[PDB]
Amino acid sequence: FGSGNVLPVKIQPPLLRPLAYRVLSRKYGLSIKSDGLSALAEFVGTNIGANWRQGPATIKFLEQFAAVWKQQERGLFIDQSGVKEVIQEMKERRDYFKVINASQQQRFSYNPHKMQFIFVPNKKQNGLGGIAGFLPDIEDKVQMFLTRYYLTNDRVMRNENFQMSITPIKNLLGRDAQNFLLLGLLNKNFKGNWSLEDPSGSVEIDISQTIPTQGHYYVPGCMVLVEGIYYSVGNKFHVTSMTLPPGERREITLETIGNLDLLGIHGISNNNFIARLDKDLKIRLHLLEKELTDHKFVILGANLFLDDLKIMTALSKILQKLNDDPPTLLIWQGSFTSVPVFASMSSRNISSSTQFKNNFDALATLLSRFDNLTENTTMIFIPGPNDLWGSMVSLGASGTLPQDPIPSAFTKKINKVCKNVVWSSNPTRIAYLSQEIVIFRDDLSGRFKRHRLEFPFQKVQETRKLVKTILDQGHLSPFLDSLRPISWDLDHTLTLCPIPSTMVLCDTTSAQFDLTYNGCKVINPGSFIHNRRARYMEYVPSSKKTIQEEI
Amino acid sequence: QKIKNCLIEKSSASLPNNPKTSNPAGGQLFKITLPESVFLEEKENCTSIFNDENVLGVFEGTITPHQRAIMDLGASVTFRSKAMGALGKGIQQGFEMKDLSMAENERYLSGFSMDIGYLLHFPFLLLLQSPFITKLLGTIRLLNQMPIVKLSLNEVLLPQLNWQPTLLKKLVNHVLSSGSWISHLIKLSQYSNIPICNLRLDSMDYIIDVLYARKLKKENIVLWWNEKAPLPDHGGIQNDFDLNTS
C-alpha cells in the first residue's frame, strides 16, 4: 500500500496500540494480541514518515485490515499471520476447479426423521490412523442399504403422481384382499424364491402373471415399484404390474436439499455449520458462457494397452495432433495392462510388477518429445480392472467399486516429464466452475444382460435402457453385495441423488452413444482400438462434442 | 440362419463346473466350426448368431491357430493328399490342412547335423539368449524371418567393483554350455512331440498343458483353455465376483 517515503523508522508498539484498539476492539472486532500488535508495527512503519499526526492514512489502514476479517471468517485472536493478511490485501490491489477422488470426498448421512442431511466428521483428520484408520466399523454394514432405501423412498413419496400410496409390507399381515403399492429391494430368499424386502420386513413374490413396464432393466438388487394382491392362505403377493421409481432432475432436487455444497468448491463444512451459496451461481454461469469456448478437454478411448506396440504407435500419432492445440484436460482411462499382474512365483523371467514399472517408463520417452502438451495440459489418470493392487486379489475380475489410485512407487518420473498429472480413483468427480462431472469405468451392459429377471411371458435402444436405469435408480451399483462388494463407508461416492450435469460412462461391451435425460448428458467413450481404427472423442463445456479418428 | 458357410452341429461335450452355474435346465450345446477370416468379418455386423439374445457363453475362443496345430498335428506331420497332384499347387499357395491331415509317429525326430550360433545381451538355427526377447525382435525386423530357439536367462547383476572378471566368468559358461543345451532340448523334444523351437527348456508346465489338453481332446471334455490369463475361460461367468470362488 504505497512506497517511496524517506525510510522505515522503528517505533515501539506502545505508541501505536491506542489507535488500533479504538478502531478495532471498541467499534467492530477485537483481540489485538501482543504478537499480532508487534506484527502490525512493520507495515505501518514502512510509510512511517510524517505520521501519527497525519489525517486519514492510519485510519484507512486499520479499515482495510478490518476488511479482510469481515471477508474471511478467520477468528478472534490476531497472530503472526497479520502480515499474511496484508499480503492478501496487496494481492487484491483458470482457477477454482478441482478433481475429487473417492477417499477425499466429504461424507453426508441422511436422517429420515428430519428429512435432512447430517455431516459426518472424517476419521482421517481427527483419528490417529497411524496403523489402521481407513478400516470401517461394523455398524455401517447394517445401514448400507437402509441409507439407499431412505433416499429412494423420500424421492418416491415426493413425486407428483403419488400422494395409491406406498404401504409398509408388514401392514399386509392380516389383510386378505385389496391392493397395495410395495416398494423395496428385489432379491432371492435363502430358500431360492423371489422376494421383496423393506426395512419393515419381507414378502415372497409371484411372477407367474406379471406384465412389466418395458423400457428399463429389472436386475436383482434394485428398488422396484410393484402392485398386486396379498393372499393370506399362504404368504404371497401376486403381482400384476411392475415398474421402477421415477427419476428427479437436479434443479428440483437441490431446492429440497437447500443449497448444500456437497462437492463444495465455494468452501468446506464441519460439524458446526454448513455452507450455501446462490448469488455466485448466476455470475459463474455467465463466466461459463463468457466466450470461453477455447477450453477443450478430451477423454480417450477406454482400455488402451501400453504393452502392445501398435497401441503405443497410435497414441504417438494422436499426441502428434494434440500437440498442435493442447487440450485443457486430457483423461487417460482404462486398464494400462493387457494381463493381470499378480505375485508371479516364477522368477526365471522378469517380474510382472517390474514389467508394470517398465511399461510406465516408455510413457516418459513418448511424452517428453511434445513439450507444449507438457507445459499447458493437465492429465487425469483413471485405473482399470488389471491394475496393480486389485489384480493381486481379483486376478483380473471386477471386485470392490472404490478402487484406489495407482501407487506412486512404480510411477515416479512421469510426474517430472509432465507438468500437471493427477491420479484418481475409479469413480471420481471433476468440479469445473458451476459443473460436476462423474468419471466411472466398468462394463455395465454385460452384467445387465447376464442378470435379468426374465419374466415368464436398433441396438442403441439398449443404451437408452441402461441410461434410464442408472439415472432413475440414482445409484451406480444397482446390485447386491454378492455381485460386487462395496466399501461400507465410501458408498456415498456411488449414490447420485443430485443428478450430475455431465456423465462419463465408458463400457467396452456397449457401443458409443450420446444421450440426454432429465437434466444431464451421458457420453460413452470405449474400445480405444476397433476394426484397425483408433478413436477418441472431444467434449466442450458448451455441450458440443466431436469424434476424432486416426487409423 | 444359413447365411454363414460354416458347420454347426448339436453336441454333448462335458462342460466344466463353475460353482455359480448350477442349474441344469436343458442341453443344446453346439460345435460351430468356421474359418477365422469370416469370423472377423462377422464381428463387424450387429446381427449374427454369436452375438444375439439368449447366449449363455463362448467356451473356446481363446485358443490360437498355432496352439490348435501344435496340439492336433504335432512335430511329425505328413501329407495324405492323393486325389489330384496338387503338391505344387499346395506349395505355391497356402496348404489348407483341415481337409487333409495325418500325424505320423515321431519316435526319431532328427539325426542332428546343422550349424548353431549365439546372440547374447548383458544389460540357420540361431539361439537367442537375451533378457528382452520382444525388444530385440522388434528393433531388428530382419530377426523375425530367421528361425530362433529362444532360451532366456535374465536379471544380470554386478558387484559394482572389479566387474571384468565376473563378466568373463559369466560369459565362459554360456560359451561352453552349447553342447548341453541342444542335447537336453532334443532329449525333451523326442518325447514331447512339440517342435524344438517352440519348446523352451525352463518351461515345464507347457509340456503338462499340451499333453493334458490333447488327452482330454481324446475324450469329449471341453478344454477351458485360456491364454496369458490367470483365470480359466468358463464362457465369461469368470469375470464376476462370487463368494464360493473367493
Curated annotation (Swiss-Prot), chain A:
Keywords: Cell cycle, Cytoplasm, DNA replication, DNA-binding, Nucleus, Phosphoprotein. GO terms for biological process: DNA-templated DNA replication; DNA-templated DNA replication maintenance of fidelity; error-prone translesion synthesis. One of its GO terms (cellular component) is nuclear replication fork. Pfam families: DNA_pol_E_B. One of its GO terms (molecular function) is DNA binding. The keyword Manganese does not apply. It is found in: Cytoplasm; Nucleus. The modification Phosphoserine is found at S477. Signal peptide: none annotated. Disulfide bonds: none annotated. Phosphorylated in a cell cycle dependent manner during late G1 phase. Phosphorylation may facilitate the interaction with POL2 or the activity of DNA polymerase II. Phosphorylation is independent of DNA replication but dependent upon CDC28 in vivo. The keyword Hydrolase does not apply. Belongs to the DNA polymerase epsilon subunit B family. DNA polymerase epsilon is a heterotetramer consisting of POL2, DPB2, DPB3 and DPB4. As accessory component of the DNA polymerase epsilon complex participates in chromosomal DNA replication. It is required during synthesis of the leading and lagging DNA strands at the replication fork and binds at/or near replication origins and moves along DNA with the replication fork. It has 3'-5' proofreading exonuclease activity that correct errors arising during DNA replication. It is also involved in DNA synthesis during DNA repair. Present with 3110 +/- 251 molecules/cell in log phase SD medium. PANTHER family: DNA POLYMERASE EPSILON SUBUNIT 2, DNA POLYMERASE EPSILON SUBUNIT B. This is DNA polymerase epsilon subunit B. It comes from Saccharomyces cerevisiae (strain ATCC 204508 / S288c). The lineage of its organism: Eukaryota, Fungi, Dikarya, Ascomycota, Saccharomycotina.
UniProtKB/Swiss-Prot annotation, chain B:
The chain holds residues 1369 to 1710 of 2222 of the full protein. It comes from the Eukaryota. In eukaryotes there are five DNA polymerases: alpha, beta, gamma, delta, and epsilon which are responsible for different reactions of DNA synthesis. DNA polymerase epsilon is a heterotetramer consisting of POL2, DPB2, DPB3 and DPB4. Signal peptide: none annotated. It comes from Saccharomyces cerevisiae (strain ATCC 204508 / S288c) (Baker's yeast). This is DNA polymerase epsilon catalytic subunit A. Catalytic component of the DNA polymerase epsilon complex which participates in chromosomal DNA replication. Required during synthesis of the leading DNA strands at the replication fork, binds at/or near replication origins and moves along DNA with the replication fork. Has 3'-5' proofreading exonuclease activity that corrects errors arising during DNA replication. The DNA polymerase activity domain resides in the N-terminal half of the protein, while the C-terminus is necessary for complexing subunits B and C. It is found in: Nucleus. Belongs to the DNA polymerase type-B family.
